[PDB]
Design a protein around this ligand. Structure first.
Ligand SMILES: O=P(O)(O)O[C@H]1[C@H](OP(=O)(O)O)[C@@H](OP(=O)(O)O)[C@H](OP(=O)(O)O)[C@@H](OP(=O)(O)O)[C@H]1OP(=O)(O)O
Ligand SMILES: O=P(O)(O)O[C@H]1[C@H](OP(=O)(O)O)[C@@H](OP(=O)(O)O)[C@H](OP(=O)(O)O)[C@@H](OP(=O)(O)O)[C@H]1OP(=O)(O)O
Ligand SMILES: [Zn+2]
Lengths: 245, 220, 45, 220, 220, 220, 220
């Protein structure tokens, strides 16, 4: 806040970011951030769930992939519509992020030989036909930020990359006011630590609980409740009628 | 290649390795873009049909176009054989009869016959006829490799029209229409298929407007 | 090179970078690209 | 092109692949900056109009510039036809009549006509006239391709005057005007729109001094 | 360029594209370091002033130094004209008048006049003089690109003396001054700007000693 | 540089740009190592002192070595002037006195003086003397740029003899001394500084054994 | 090197930088495989001993091989001195001193007397003798760089016979042997060391069959 108004103005003249981003990053009250936004003439699921789609912009085809559970985006303008570039983008996004499922349509390029080879090589599950409202809203938001930044852009690729860079970091999301990158980092880190801790205790703790049936294994005991799993089915019972051995 | 000696006589020479290396690398780098069509005539000046065949055989892959051009060469050789009456009888010393279809194709005529025909008076531009046939084959190959037509191209609502007119002319050069039709389309299509503001400015300018004034009027 | 740097910035947050003195690394385009993203450019660990 | 032998005559030669490759790569890489204007004259000395036409055709992309060059060549050919009307009467043996506009453009004239005209006594500078027409076309195309004018160059507050005056001279050289007008620009506009501190320093220095004092004055 | 026939007379030839490409690449790629002074003098062993101008104006970017050298060339031409005015009166047949300032600058004189001057008896190395003029400007150009002075060089606490003395000699060579003052400063400023340990070691060796003993003591 | 002419008197020749490009490339890519000594003599055969200075100034960076070699050149020139009788006074046409200490360095002598000296009868190999002075400077600066010694190379228990003898010979060539001491060290140190197994093998082989049987016995 | 002038006589020339650069880079980067032996004989044709030793010592790395070949050159010089009687006596015009072992190595002789030997009648092929000595040394050093014997090549159970026979032939060529023993080995060893299935297949095929039958039968 100490002389941060000047920095906020000099960075909003270049980014045109939302008021909450300036408030959180630069430690400014929301009122002055909203005033800065107004004063600008240009402003008024599992982690593997990824959706890829094709859009048309100024006579150019663009393939854009979105992380459904975190809002992360990645777009690239394909020069000539062919499945080879679709497969190249798929393998690049696989090499940059772990993906377990693909949500695309039944297009010819989506079912290309190279795309199928790449998806089989990566072991990614394929699901044709599809939540889409979030994809459409992100598409319109990227279109409007592209329109905003096109005045200072020379080519389409640079403008698209600038829009992606602004959207993924300089835009606070929903719950908690966290950007797409923060959300995806948080969710993948939490998944990693939870799976580590879950795999850590399986070797040590092994108890057998009888209820009402069979030798089920203890999963969680406390708060007057026993949750267990038997025959790949999870059952929750009260503390009564449950013997722990 | 056949290069005239300094104050001497035209003597046949071997093809330089670097020229054919450049030809094959530019063929493999580009997917038979129209710009390679003039470049061919920039590398095969005064070359015997045997040299043309040797240069043609250097291509790696893209054999469908090579088969198509070979078929068109064969049919053109047949047409040349059928249109020109075949002289029969003794061969005059120092000269030779009219080349056959396989002779103009260069697959049977020896180098000595090619040299004799080149030095023959009146001149025999058999190599030039073969080069023109190859040019026609390359034109139809470019038509084969054209990814889209010209009448279906559209201009983006917010696209700067510089790239629009650039790609419009790039696609236009690939067209195999007559010159008058080309003039008509380059006068009508681009002015009738623009953005509303630029099209309004152009129709205000009226007909007979050169493309320089066309683009300077729509500058933004 | 500037396009690749912009892609890297769009994928991960970068504050500073150390690089050698190659001709393409000292060009005006990469200088403008790093001026945009506010990358602390250092030549020369 | 056509090269002169050691104390000999002017003999034709095929186009060197290195020259055309360098030309096309420098055109692609350097876009349409003015510094390519001299390079063209470095790669076209003693060359036939056919060679210039081939070199213009080899470059791919930016087809609007090529179309504008073609139309300017056509209108210059019309001007040549208009200033030198169609001659008549038999031509003496060993001589060829004055080339038409199409012959100068090279669209209807074979290389043999160029060879005859170049070696004719007195020499016919058809190639030089075509080169000058291409130079005028390139001048107008680099005037067209200039991103902005010269009267709107604004110096940033934190921007040092080094790159400011560099781009000011870039736009000045990109502008086509008279030598006296350019001198007036370099005398007034360089200081009339500078940063206020440098403006005051230059006013303290006094008009009528070399720009070396200007660059050594406002350092920092 | 200007060459001599084998046991014959002097002739003029076109400029090799390779040399111009290498010159422009080496100028643009690295920097405006002092090694441009030898490199340029290694690519102009005999050429007309028009050739020098063509080699000069092809540079892309950094037009501020180009304007500096153009202004220095103009003032040198003016001073040459005022100190040695071209004598008036009749001109003897078979010769031509003395080149003017515009002639040595190459702005107005044609290539034929330059060739005639080079082959004249006695020969006029006017273009060569022009080259030396450019050299003078180039010196000032290096003064443009010196980032520091000859005194603000200091050795870091973790910086070995190798790159320290390398930078010191680089800045000394970038300095345009007398040789005697350079010798005076290289015998004194080296020890003053050195880390205390090796500084005191080399002082114990003896002041004014050559760098051989200094570097043998400063090892590690 | 200096080019021998076909049954004719020698004439001055410029330096090919590729020669300088290769020289600067090999200087930059590899640090100061003995292998640059032959390469130098492979690019400066019969070259004039001016050409030697021009190619020496082309280097970039490492100016400390350049200053050291300039100092050694100056001291060698002073010694040469002291040992040979100084010359002065007028000389008959077609002849001139021997080059001074500054003339052999090329800092005052012009190209014409060097050409006259090399074409003199009998010729004066001043260029060869300057080249051998440069060779001595290169030897001493390669000795300067050798970090490791000859008496510190050790063979590891698992280290093969191949790279051991390789580095031994690297250091042997990097060290400048008499031939006899080089033979003594290359006969004694290699066996005296090896693993015990190969040491006993070589002792069994006996003194004076050839290197081939030595290394085919130590191998394994 | 010494080259044949067009319709002229033998003329000495320096080594082009391209040839030596290509030689050193291919030697350092590709291998010490025997296929480099023809390459050398394709580069040193019509050379001089000075050029031979300059090319020999320029290449860096693997200086143990350099010392080995120097030792073999010294021993071959001793052999030449001892087998060919040394004729000591007066030297008359039209004759020069007898070639020596050190003269063949190009150590005690300079370039001009080597040229005189080349032009001397009767011709003295000292360069050819040095080249064949280098060939013998290179054969010894390529024998040194064969890590495996010829009797230890065994086909792996899962190893395809293609690369197996390829490396078998490579090691056979690298092996120093006569023609008849090579024929015996290529007739016996390959079938005596194959996989059992192809072993029985080729035994069923029987003798008197070329490698085509063996390779068509061992597939699968
Ligand atoms: O055009 P490329 O296929 O890449 O080959 C070039 C070309 O050599 P050629 O003229 O023999 O084909 C260069 O010559 P120019 O482009 O200047 O006409 C040459 O340059 P130098 O001869 O001056 O070395 C260069 O070599 P380099 O890459 O070392 O600069 C070499 O490339 P390659 O050496 O890779 O074949
Ligand atoms: O040796 P050649 O087969 O006759 O080819 C040469 C050679 O070029 P390459 O080494 O690239 O093949 C020359 O280079 P130098 O050997 O003289 O260094 C080159 O001269 P430039 O590279 O300086 O242009 C010359 O070209 P030109 O005849 O134009 O002087 C060119 O001859 P070609 O043009 O016939 O290939
Ligand atoms: Zn805004």
């Amino acid at each position: 806040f100490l002389d941060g108004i000047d920095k906020a103005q000099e960075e909003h003249e270049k980014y045109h970011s939302n008021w909450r981003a300036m408030a959180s990053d630069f430690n400014l009250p929301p009122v002055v951030a909203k005033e800065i936004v107004a004063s600008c003439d240009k402003c008024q699921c599992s982690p593997g769930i990824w959706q890829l789609n094709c859009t048309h912009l100024e006579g150019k085809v663009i393939l854009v992939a979105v992380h459904v559970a975190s809002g992360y985006i990645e777009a690239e303008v394909i020069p000539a519509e062919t499945g080879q570039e679709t497969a190249y983008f798929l393998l690049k996004l696989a090499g940059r992020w772990p993906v377990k499922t693909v949500h695309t349509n039944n297009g010819s390029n989506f079912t290309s030989t190279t795309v199928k080879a790449a998806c089989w090589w990566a072991g990614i599950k394929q699901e044709f036909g599809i939540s889409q409202g979030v994809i459409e809203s992100m598409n319109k938001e990227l279109k409007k930020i592209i329109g905003q930044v096109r005045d200072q852009a020379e080519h389409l690729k640079t403008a698209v990359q600038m829009a992606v860079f602004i959207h993924n970091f300089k835009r606070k999301g929903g719950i908690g006011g966290y950007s797409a990158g923060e959300r995806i980092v948080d969710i993948i880190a939490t998944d990693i630590q939870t799976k580590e801790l879950q795999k850590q205790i399986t070797k040590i703790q092994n108890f057998r609980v009888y209820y009402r049936k069979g030798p089920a294994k203890l999963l969680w005991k406390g708060e007057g409740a026993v949750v267990i799993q038997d025959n790949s089915d999870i059952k929750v019972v009260p503390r009564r009628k449950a013997k722990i051995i | 290649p056949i290069v005239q000696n300094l104050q001497g006589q035209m003597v046949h020479q071997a093809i330089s390795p670097r020229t054919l290396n450049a030809w094959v690398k530019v063929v493999e780098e580009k997917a038979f873009s129209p710009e390679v069509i003039p470049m061919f005539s920039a590398l095969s000046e005064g070359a015997t049909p045997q040299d043309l065949n040797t240069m043609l055989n250097t291509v790696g892959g893209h054999q469908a176009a090579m088969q198509m051009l070979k078929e068109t060469i064969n049919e053109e050789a047949a047409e040349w054989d059928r249109l020109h009456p075949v002289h029969a009888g003794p061969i005059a010393p120092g000269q030779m009869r009219e080349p056959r279809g396989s002779d103009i194709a260069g697959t049977t005529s020896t180098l000595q016959e090619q040299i004799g025909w080149m030095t023959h008076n009146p001149p025999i531009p058999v190599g030039e006829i073969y080069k023109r046939w190859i040019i026609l084959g390359l034109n139809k190959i470019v038509r084969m490799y054209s990814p889209t037509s010209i009448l279906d191209i559209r201009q983006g609502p917010k696209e700067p029209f510089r790239d629009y007119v650039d790609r419009f002319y790039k696609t236009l050069r690939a067209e195999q229409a007559s010159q008058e039709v080309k003039n008509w389309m380059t006068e009508t299509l681009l002015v009738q298929n623009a953005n509303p503001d630029c099209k309004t400015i152009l129709k205000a300018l009226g007909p007979g407007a050169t493309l320089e004034e066309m683009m300077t009027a729509c500058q933004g | 090179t500037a396009y690749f740097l912009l892609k890297l910035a769009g994928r991960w947050p970068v504050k500073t970078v150390h690089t050698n003195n190659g001709s393409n690394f000292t060009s005006t385009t990469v200088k403008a690209a790093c001026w945009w993203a506010g990358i602390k450019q250092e030549f020369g660990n």
